[PDB]
Design a protein around this motif. Structure first.
Motif, PDB file in Angstrom:
ATOM      1  N   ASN A   1       1.354   6.006  -7.170  1.00 55.90           N
ATOM      2  CA  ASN A   1       0.482   7.033  -7.605  1.00 55.90           C
ATOM      3  C   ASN A   1       1.358   8.394  -7.578  1.00 55.90           C
ATOM      4  O   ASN A   1       1.155   9.321  -8.446  1.00 55.90           O
TER       5      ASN A   1
ATOM      6  N   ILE B   1      -9.499   1.990  -5.989  1.00 52.48           N
ATOM      7  CA  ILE B   1      -9.828   1.009  -5.747  1.00 52.48           C
ATOM      8  C   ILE B   1      -9.098   0.258  -4.264  1.00 52.48           C
ATOM      9  O   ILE B   1      -9.404  -0.162  -3.572  1.00 52.48           O
ATOM     10  N   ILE B   2      -7.643   0.273  -4.790  1.00 50.84           N
ATOM     11  CA  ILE B   2      -6.727  -0.306  -3.749  1.00 50.84           C
ATOM     12  C   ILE B   2      -6.849   0.476  -2.393  1.00 50.84           C
ATOM     13  O   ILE B   2      -6.876  -0.383  -1.199  1.00 50.84           O
ATOM     14  N   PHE B   3      -7.186   1.855  -2.432  1.00 53.47           N
ATOM     15  CA  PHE B   3      -7.056   2.450  -1.284  1.00 53.47           C
ATOM     16  C   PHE B   3      -8.531   2.241  -0.451  1.00 53.47           C
ATOM     17  O   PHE B   3      -8.621   1.992   0.655  1.00 53.47           O
TER      18      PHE B   3
ATOM     19  N   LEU C   1      -7.684   2.464 -10.385  1.00 51.33           N
ATOM     20  CA  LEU C   1      -6.986   1.342  -9.663  1.00 51.33           C
ATOM     21  C   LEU C   1      -6.534   1.840  -8.528  1.00 51.33           C
ATOM     22  O   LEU C   1      -7.002   1.284  -7.253  1.00 51.33           O
ATOM     23  N   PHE C   2      -5.902   2.929  -8.223  1.00 54.30           N
ATOM     24  CA  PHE C   2      -5.145   3.398  -6.970  1.00 54.30           C
ATOM     25  C   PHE C   2      -6.457   3.362  -6.131  1.00 54.30           C
ATOM     26  O   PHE C   2      -6.437   3.567  -4.837  1.00 54.30           O
TER      27      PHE C   2
ATOM     28  N   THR D   1       2.095   1.954  -3.199  1.00 58.69           N
ATOM     29  CA  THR D   1       1.032   2.277  -4.171  1.00 58.69           C
ATOM     30  C   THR D   1       0.949   3.856  -3.909  1.00 58.69           C
ATOM     31  O   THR D   1       0.887   4.619  -4.970  1.00 58.69           O
TER      32      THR D   1
ATOM     33  N   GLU E   1      -8.864  -0.829   1.321  1.00 57.80           N
ATOM     34  CA  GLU E   1      -8.179  -0.697   2.548  1.00 57.80           C
ATOM     35  C   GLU E   1      -8.907   0.058   3.609  1.00 57.80           C
ATOM     36  O   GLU E   1      -9.045  -0.547   4.955  1.00 57.80           O
TER      37      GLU E   1
ATOM     38  N   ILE F   1       0.773  -1.188   0.130  1.00 58.04           N
ATOM     39  CA  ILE F   1      -0.128  -0.032   0.094  1.00 58.04           C
ATOM     40  C   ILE F   1       0.896   1.048  -0.091  1.00 58.04           C
ATOM     41  O   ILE F   1       0.853   2.178  -0.604  1.00 58.04           O
TER      42      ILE F   1
END
Ligand SMILES: *[C@@H]1O[C@H](CO)[C@@H](O)[C@H](O)[C@H]1NC(C)=O
Lengths: 103, 58, 221, 97
Positions: free
Chosen positions: C24, C55-57, C52-53, C20, C60, C17
């Motif tokens: 980012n 969704i990843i955050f 994408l970034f 990421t 979390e 993360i």
């Protein structure tokens, strides 16, 4: 009030600022009369802050007197007009931290 | 040195944060009619840092 | 059930993360801000990558809110962490619908702050910098009064007196005479006067674009 | 210009896209006007423009002889253009050809 005026001011607006200027300096004269009656002038000269009030209030008053004449029309010495704003330092002394830092 | 790198790195992020913000605000909005004398512009990130650092030095 | 989500935090996935956030961060510098709605080929990919970034955050937050409680998670350094997630979803949601849509993206420049929050070896030095700011408030307070006292004085004396610039006398064109306009005070007043072949007429060309004069009080500060 | 080259079939693809806002647009307009000034009265011309869509700055929509008059229309149309949109070379060149 001193921060209200701006270029291209309205003649009505100019009068309103002067009206408050006459009113506010009046209250600061009540500060004079009320304070001096509380304790005689000899104690008023004791502390500089009270001394600093002498020139400020009278400077305001003479400006009001100079306002009686109208060199301009609502269709020259401008040195005593700054005494109004300069009184703001008295506010600065209130803060215990700042005054000792500056002193 | 274990702390100087951390301090300097932390300073670097701040310049990056404001440099990136500068692009989002003034990005490409310095294109004025007058002759292009606006070298200290905010156009692209590598040139945005120079403008930000210029403000820091003032 | 909730225990399954919490045990994930134990697994050192904070590296991915955090990368990421760094990944980012490299996805923002490449973004070329073209002047007026233009966008080259690469900018088209970054917005797709931006999803994408997001969704990843976003996942979390769900992983870290269920595991650490809805109320307690904001009550930490993550307050800004959720601050980005909330408003970023608005940006993608509002843009797809179609103003201030474009300008709202500025919140994404705050993600790098998460980078200094993630590593505990840098949170201490930042607090060291901030902890030293409290004494300087008094200096800030003094500078605040220096601005105010001098700004008010500036109004009274220089009350919009920079609005008379020298104009050509021929009269074919009504434009400032000098290539670098400078305020002039005509005769009967103290100051500079024009040359043999120009006059100081009351237009407005003294200050540069009317930004560095004492007209208003905001202009005075 | 009469002997330097034979007649022509001009087609000026002005790039009025968001990336040319500001000084670049002024240079584009001045250069296009000068070019139209460098065309004889026996060669044709037109002025297109692509901003993700290849429209025509003027009322002609084809080649118009670059006469003394048509040059004026093209010059005025070029002068009254603005930068906006996204550049698209493929569509513009397809329109031109
Ligand atoms: C310039 O072109 C625009 C295109 O829409 C048009 O609206 C405007 O009236 C034109 N102005 C002149 C002076 O031709």
């Amino acid at each position: 009030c001193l921060a209200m005026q701006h270029y291209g001011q309205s003649c009505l607006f100019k009068i309103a600022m002067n009206i408050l200027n006459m009113l506010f300096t009046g209250l600061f004269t009540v500060e004079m009369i009320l304070k001096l009656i509380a304790f005689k002038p000899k104690g008023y000269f004791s502390d500089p802050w009270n001394v600093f009030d002498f020139l400020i209030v009278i400077g305001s008053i003479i400006d009001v007197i100079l306002s009686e004449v109208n060199p301009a029309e609502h269709t020259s010495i401008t040195f005593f007009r700054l005494f109004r704003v300069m009184r703001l330092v008295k506010l600065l002394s209130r803060g215990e931290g700042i005054r000792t830092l500056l002193w | 040195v274990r702390s100087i790198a951390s301090l300097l790195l932390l300073l670097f992020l701040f310049i990056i944060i404001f440099s990136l913000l500068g692009m989002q605000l003034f990005g490409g909005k310095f294109n004025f009619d007058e002759m292009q004398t606006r070298r200290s512009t905010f156009d692209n990130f590598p040139q945005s840092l120079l403008t930000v650092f210029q403000i820091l030095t003032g | 059930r909730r225990a399954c989500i919490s045990i994930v935090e134990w697994k050192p996935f904070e590296i991915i993360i955090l990368l990421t956030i760094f990944a980012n961060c490299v996805a923002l510098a490449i973004y070329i801000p073209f002047p007026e709605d233009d966008s080259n080929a690469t900018n088209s990919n970054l917005e797709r990558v931006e999803y994408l970034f997001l969704i990843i955050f976003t996942v979390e937050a769900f992983l870290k809110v269920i595991a650490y409680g809805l109320l307690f998670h904001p009550n930490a350094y993550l307050r800004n962490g959720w601050n980005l997630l909330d408003f970023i979803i608005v940006v993608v949601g509002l843009f797809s619908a179609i103003f201030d849509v474009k300008a709202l993206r500025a919140f994404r420049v705050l993600r790098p702050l998460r980078l200094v929050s993630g590593v505990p070896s840098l949170q201490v030095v930042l607090n060291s910098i901030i902890k030293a700011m409290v004494p300087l408030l008094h200096i800030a307070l003094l500078v605040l009064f220096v601005i105010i006292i001098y700004a008010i004085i500036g109004l009274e004396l220089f009350m919009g007196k920079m609005h008379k610039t020298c104009y050509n006398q021929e009269g074919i064109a009504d434009v400032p005479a000098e290539d670098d306009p400078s305020p002039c005070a005509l005769e009967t007043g103290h100051g500079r006067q024009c040359q043999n072949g120009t006059v100081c007429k009351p237009g407005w060309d003294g200050p540069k674009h009317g930004i560095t004069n004492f007209d208003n009080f905001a202009f005075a500060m | 210009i009469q002997g330097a080259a034979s007649p022509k079939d001009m087609l000026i693809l002005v790039d009025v896209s968001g990336s040319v806002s500001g000084l670049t647009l002024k240079l584009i307009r001045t250069s296009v006007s000068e070019m139209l000034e460098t065309l004889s009265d026996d060669d044709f011309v037109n002025v297109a423009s692509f901003n993700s869509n290849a429209q025509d700055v003027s009322c002609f929509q084809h080649l118009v002889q670059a006469n003394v008059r048509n040059k004026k229309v093209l010059k005025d149309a070029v002068n009254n253009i603005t930068a906006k949109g996204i550049t698209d070379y493929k569509k513009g060149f397809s329109f031109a050809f």
